[PDB]
Design a protein around this ligand. Structure first.
Ligand SMILES: Nc1nc2c(ncn2[C@@H]2O[C@H](COP(=O)(O)OP(=O)(O)O)[C@@H](O)[C@H]2O)c(=O)[nH]1
Ligand SMILES: [Mg+2]
Length: 152
């Protein structure tokens, strides 16, 4: 079993990605996944409010094996804040944690402010994994979780 925490500014789609993956709908939780030689259980921790209650970050993310740090591709501030979220994960967890940086809302194509290239560069700069998703369209949501699960 592996504790996976979702992190990111308000309104980026942290809950929506979990919903889409767990229930396949769009408006902790346990999910078992089957890998070639392994079978593992992900515990998906989601919360609102963390950007307001910063001092709770260390304890909320305490024993995480993975952190999925989400921004909204139409919202530059949400992308800029992901360095801060990732620094919170490293401070608490060191290198004992898989991190996936996620640019969500790819279906809002005409409102995009962060190109896929800038997301990829930030991920490479910080040595984390990267993907883009649409929770609404269901694009790359299963890919996100299968890559994280394979890396654990
Ligand atoms: N167009 C679009 N809207 C989304 C997507 N994901 C989430 N949203 C919307 O963005 C808002 C915030 O999503 P939510 O899951 O609540 O974000 P959270 O605050 O990060 O949990 C809601 O109105 C969602 O319907 C997406 O992939 N595409
Ligand atoms: Mg939420």
């Amino acid at each position: 079993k592996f504790k996976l925490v979702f992190l990111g500014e308000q309104s980026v789609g942290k809950t929506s990605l979990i919903t889409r993956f767990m229930y396949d709908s769009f408006d902790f939780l346990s999910k078992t996944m089957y890998l070639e030689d392994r079978t593992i259980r992900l515990q998906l921790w989601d919360t609102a409010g963390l950007e307001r209650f910063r001092s709770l970050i260390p304890s909320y993310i305490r024993d995480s094996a993975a952190a999925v740090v989400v921004y909204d591709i139409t919202n530059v501030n949400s992308f800029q804040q992901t360095t801060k979220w990732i620094d919170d994960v490293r401070t608490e967890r060191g290198s004992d944690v898989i991190i996936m940086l996620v640019g969500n809302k790819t279906d809002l194509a005409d409102k995009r402010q962060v190109s896929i290239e800038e997301g990829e560069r930030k991920a490479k700069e910080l040595n984390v994994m990267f993907i883009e998703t649409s929770a609404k369209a269901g694009y790359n949501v299963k890919q996100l979780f299968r890559r994280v699960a394979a890396a654990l």
